[PDB]
Amino acid sequence: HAPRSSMMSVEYDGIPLSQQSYASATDLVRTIPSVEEALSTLDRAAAALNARRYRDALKLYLEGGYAMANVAERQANPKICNLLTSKGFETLNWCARLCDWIEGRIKEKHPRPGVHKVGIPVSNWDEDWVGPFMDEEEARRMWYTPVYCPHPIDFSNLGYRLRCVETGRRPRLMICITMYNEGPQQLKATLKKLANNLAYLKEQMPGDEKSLTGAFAGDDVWQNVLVCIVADGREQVHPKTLDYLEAIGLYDEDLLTINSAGIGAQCHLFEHTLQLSVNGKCLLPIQTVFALKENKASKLDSHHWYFNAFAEQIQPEYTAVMDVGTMLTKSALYHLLFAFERNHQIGGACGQLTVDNPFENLSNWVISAQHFEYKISNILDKSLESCFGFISVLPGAFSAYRYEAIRGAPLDAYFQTLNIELDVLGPFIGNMYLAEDRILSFEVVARKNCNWTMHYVKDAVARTDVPHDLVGLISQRKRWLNGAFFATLFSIWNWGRIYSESKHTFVRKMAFLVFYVYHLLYTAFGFFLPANLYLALFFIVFQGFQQNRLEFIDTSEYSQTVLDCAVYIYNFSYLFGLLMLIIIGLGNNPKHMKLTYYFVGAVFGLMMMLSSLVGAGIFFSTPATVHSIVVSILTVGVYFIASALHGEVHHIFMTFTHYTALIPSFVNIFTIYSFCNKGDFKDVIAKRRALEELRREEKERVENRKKNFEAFRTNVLLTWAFSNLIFALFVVYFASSSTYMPVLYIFVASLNTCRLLGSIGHWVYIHTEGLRGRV
Amino acid sequence: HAPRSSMMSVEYDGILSQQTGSYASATDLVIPSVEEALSTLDRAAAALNARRYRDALKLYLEGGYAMANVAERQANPKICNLLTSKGFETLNWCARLCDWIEGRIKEKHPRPGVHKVGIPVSNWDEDWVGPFMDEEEARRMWYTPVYCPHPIDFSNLGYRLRCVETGRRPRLMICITMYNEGPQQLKATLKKLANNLAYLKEQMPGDEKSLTGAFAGDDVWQNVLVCIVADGREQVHPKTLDYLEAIGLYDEDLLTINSAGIGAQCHLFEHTLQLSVNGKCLLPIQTVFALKENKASKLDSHHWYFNAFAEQIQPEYTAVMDVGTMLTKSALYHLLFAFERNHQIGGACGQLTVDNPFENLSNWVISAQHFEYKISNILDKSLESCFGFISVLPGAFSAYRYEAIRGAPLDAYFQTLNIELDVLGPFIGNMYLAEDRILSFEVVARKNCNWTMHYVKDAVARTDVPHDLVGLISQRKRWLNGAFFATLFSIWNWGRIYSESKHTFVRKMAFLVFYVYHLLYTAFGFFLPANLYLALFFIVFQGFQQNRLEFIDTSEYSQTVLDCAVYIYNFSYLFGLLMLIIIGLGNNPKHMKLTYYFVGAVFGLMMMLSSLVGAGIFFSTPATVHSIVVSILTVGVYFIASALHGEVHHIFMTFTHYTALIPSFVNIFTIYSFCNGDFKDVIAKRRALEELRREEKERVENRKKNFEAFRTNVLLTWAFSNLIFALFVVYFASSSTYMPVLYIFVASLNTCRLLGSIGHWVYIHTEGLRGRV
Ligand SMILES: O=c1ccn([C@@H]2O[C@H](COP(=O)(O)OP(=O)(O)O)[C@@H](O)[C@H]2O)c(=O)[nH]1
Ligand SMILES: O=c1ccn([C@@H]2O[C@H](COP(=O)(O)OP(=O)(O)O)[C@@H](O)[C@H]2O)c(=O)[nH]1
Ligand SMILES: [Mn+2]
Ligand SMILES: [Mn+2]
């Protein structure tokens, strides 16, 4: 009791010691503004305008205007004084306009601050430079404007204009560069490659049958080409990248902050016909418009902005979409434009995607495997598809379209994920639209009342920098095969539109039906690819080792323990690896398990290298019958035949070992990880309750969306995995190698015959259409 | 070319503030209101939080004068008075802050003065019966917002409670954590607490069995404080808030007004609320309600409760329970009786049961949960309380005396909150995902203190278990996820009991014996899925295939069905397990109710047929002495303990339902648990801002990477250990060589649990007579 009394006594001493003048406080607060509070006040005004509170929006607008008007006087930097004075004057003009609008002397719908584009001198210039002809206004001045347009369809309706439109020049070919958290060297390489393309376009000889004629002639082509660089978020772009953009005279943080205070811009446009010099050669000027967007979005949203806003503004003749860090050959644009002009029927084209410096760093197995995969995918698949006038464009590939089969329905279908929220669409459409450039491909192919096909250009080589690590490749294939496994399902489900709506020729529709049957067979085979690979390895290797079917070894008697031990070890290792793959995939992100993924990949690697050696052994021990040699050459050397036919066989000769070492890891891991993922207080209280109910409804909608997405993905993954497992178990238990290996050989031979025929058709078409152009 | 020329001509025609080196009319166009006053105040609070003292005062005067002008126009007398009082207080705080800035008054970390406001309660009952009450306390309700970021300084910042102000010194102190529940659970909990207080009141005096001291009759309600702490005002149920207003404890108007510029961290509402049910008027109950704005954890609610309020009023015993936990009339009496008579228990745990077991007997999930609760309580709690160390069940109604929980145990409990979990790691994260048993271990192994624990059987606490298998999945997802790392902690740091704590030699020897048993039990339960699969496979299917079921002769048969049974069982089990891990480690187990129910039913009828063949195998065997001994000791241990403790009818009713849910239980729950200035200064400030944002994002992603990697590594270890063990025993051991081993292991575990239950019974029925010695 004594400690309790002592503690309460010290507490009682504790409570004693507003406890635990207005004129003086009034004098203190009365006793200058600043840029920080001015910017905060304009930000609050923009928020109020967004929330449609006009009285307090106005009240916060004149305060900020006068704050910057007073601040501009005391600043020391003349450019800062000019920027703040202009901002204050424009804000006062907008305040007067808003006051008049509220008074009603002028009637207008949805008032917004007037669109003001400002041109500030570029900090850095090269006095020693060579150019055909350029005006001081365009050359020296850098133009920037902030845009609020939420629906890029109304970008031109809100008075936004580009420097090309203002000077009256008419761009025809127009390229997009979607950049996000990329280093300066990638942008520098991309811009240097584009400048090289423009220079090579200039160097076309006039009066030649092969050379292009028209708006793409020499000495005047750079004017007709506009490059649009659209970033994904100002909070995610690399600081070194922004430093590079300032160095090339295209970005200014000070100007952006000053002139984007009260506008509440969704994205910022910087326009500059930037010129570049590399060593002693000076690149020709390239027209560049840089669209830096405020909030983080997706590549689909970047394309939404690009396509809708700028394309509907300037009506380009050809529209090109390209990633960041992709180096183009000198003649990539020439080949694209040549194909477009000579065909006058192509709705869209895809360039060849390759790996930068394949020969260099040959010690890296992942790089060589990716190079082999790119080369085989391009040659075989793209040739076969372009023979049929329909391309499943590789993600990230340098692709272009003509803005005549893209203007309407294909773009609406492409952007319907953004326009209509995916909750109504469902999870199938969302997974469809993770990668939808191929959706654009299909929509252009199936345009109503239009027969616009596609074409794959082998000569338009686009060199990119593929990931050098297995985890980066895993993430890449997480995106790629998903888009893929869903746009494919779209293609089967909607192949009827090509005949129901589009007006193709009868022969074209028959060819499309044939390609549809082939595509069904190929997708069905690739769906059971893990099961088929496991069965092939199991049967051939281990049931030749156990049943003495390897014609180079004699395992008739042996110890009888190792014979079954090999099969048991293989089955257990494969099953354990697959289960670990499920757990890790579906589980955590594939970056902290670099060691585990490398271990599993190496296990599969030596597993298919020993498989390759035993396959070569049985092949060489076989007496090489006519049928056997025919099927073997057709199924294996199809890659070498196509590569030698097209010219690039050395890449395959160098990378086939690296790819076949990475084949099981490739299929298993990548597919499994892809499939694995002035009111009063009563009004105040009512507003609080309404906001709370809005938050609750938003949370319930988000959780319902997540529930639907995860349920759909788990259902599709369970279907895929259980189908593979059931197929493998059933064939293992009810079919021998003699009854299943011939079937698998016939299936793979049919697919490889189709791909060889496609590549041969592409070659003969591209080498014979020139002479037979008259007929 | 014509369309392009036409389009450009159209743009030229459409192109009419218009589209280096008037204002008077707008000014003339340019009264206050409550909304802008609240917004202004609010920011002022944000600026003060950002240490913008030079700005703060001006917005504070703006808000103060805004409300000073607003209060006159309000027609509501109570709103007018409240706004006028808040404006006067805000102006006083503004003057004090101005003096502090001028420097005439020097103070550290200025903050608005803490003031408690007493408004009359909307609802009062004229007709009531009570011993004695003052009009001030009964008629009026007090409230105060708190800023204390570290609840350790609750008393330092000047916060006082009505008990402290009136001089009442609470001794028993009981917490009720609440989050997004409905009014009926709170009403049931408060009615049960009032019943407990009534039982404590009507205890006869001058009796050996009856309590004596501060818990006597007619005055017990004064000495007990109820602290109900919510988790977030954005998550509490609207109906719950209406109930709190009805009982005179909550006010949206008062909270919004008085919390405008304080930037409080939680809101305290104090009201000795009186409740009346039918013709019986319940005795008043001292209740303090702490509502915090931002969603937090039950650990954070306990942080607030323990640190702030316990360090303020220094209770003799502190107690913790959830909402929806109906306590019997004698639960509090039994807790206090045990505490007073022992003077050695550092913390106690009450029995957890299911509300209305007999009713709704058709619900297999309810019956299985009732069986699990009963057997867990009896066996595990009795065995653990015999050794004076309880792994308290999560959500159970537990209490600790505030003498072995004051310091180091509480610091160890809250260290996850005090120091960020990035330094601790994922082990400590899933360690403190549930740590009531962490309190248990710290109390047991507190340095220079030997405070054991005691499980009270008679203090029955009835809760409302989920009625759906998905709800049971989520419950077990929390429960044994915490429990596994709890056993890991106890296993790793069992050396502290001998190195630091000063227990008796016999107590340390008993603790060592229990440690050996706990090691064996945790090892057995780690391989529980593998052991269950082996038992089912061997017994059922290798008796069917090898003709070892003594009630049937399958010697010849068709030779196809014999292998077909084993193949079907293996394939179904493997497919079920793979689907389980995927569904478990993928999507949230609430959209897949059909799939989970299908797998659970498959396992259910599977163990029904397993039980039928076992019974056949137990009725066709000549029942030798060894066989009957092992079988009774391994199976009827539940019935023996239940008959010893008197609660055998529950087992008789729910054993079939539980054995129908054993494989789902063990497989699904274990899998789903283990499976989861100028312009330059402005620019520099922006650079600091998004650099800090990037650093925080990197830290969060690194924390997530580490936690997920540890989770996946542990899950891989568990699953692969189970699979390797199962495959090895299947391929290298027959049933005749592994069934005896499994029977001996389970018999040893059940013998330990039976001995613990019997010891608890004999102790609780013999310690009374042998109290002299
Ligand atoms: O959220 C994102 C991620 C990327 N990108 C950009 O859009 C393209 C997507 O290609 P990415 O490099 O992501 O694909 P990959 O080459 O990694 O397979 C690239 O230009 C990215 O910089 C984007 O706009 N938003
Ligand atoms: O984020 C949360 C979730 C719950 N709770 C509360 O803390 C206890 C957690 O027990 P839970 O309801 O999870 O267990 P159950 O009653 O479901 O078995 C309950 O009183 C919850 O209302 C909390 O404070 N914070
Ligand atoms: Mn890229
Ligand atoms: Mn509960």
Numbering used by the authors:
A (entry chain A): 23 to 39, 49 to 51, 77 to 87, 91 to 736, 762 to 859
B (entry chain B): 23 to 37, 39, 49 to 51, 59 to 60, 77 to 85, 91 to 736, 763 to 859
Show me the paper's own sentences about this structure.
Chitin is synthesized by chitin synthase (CHS), a membrane-integrated protein belonging to the glycosyltransferase family 2, consisting of a glycosyltransferase (GT) domain and a transmembrane (TM) region. A short N-terminal domain (NTD) exists in some CHSs, like Phytophthora sojae chitin synthase 1 (PsCHS1), to stabilize the dimerization.
To capture the structure of chitin-bound PsCHS, we incubated the enzyme in the presence of UDP-GlcNAc and Mn2+ for 15 min or 40 min before cryo-EM sample preparation. However, only a UDP- and Mn2+-occupied structure was resolved for both samples with overall resolutions of 3.20 Å and 2.94 Å, respectively. PsCHS forms a dimer, as previously reported. Each protomer contains a long transmembrane helix, with its N-terminal region extending to the adjacent protomer, stabilizing the dimer with the interaction interface located at the GT domain as well as the TM region. UDP and Mn2+ are positioned in the reaction cavity of the GT domain, where PsCHS stabilizes UDP via hydrogen bonding and π-π stacking interactions. Q535 of the amphipathic interface helices (IF2) forms two hydrogen bonds with the pyrophosphate group, while other hydrogen bonds occur between the uridine portion of UDP and the GT domain. Specifically, E241, D382, V383, T237, and Y239 form hydrogen bonds with the ribose moiety, while D291, K355, K358, and S361 bond with the uracil moiety. IF1 and IF2 connect the GT domain and transmembrane helices, framing the entrance of the potential chitin translocation channel.
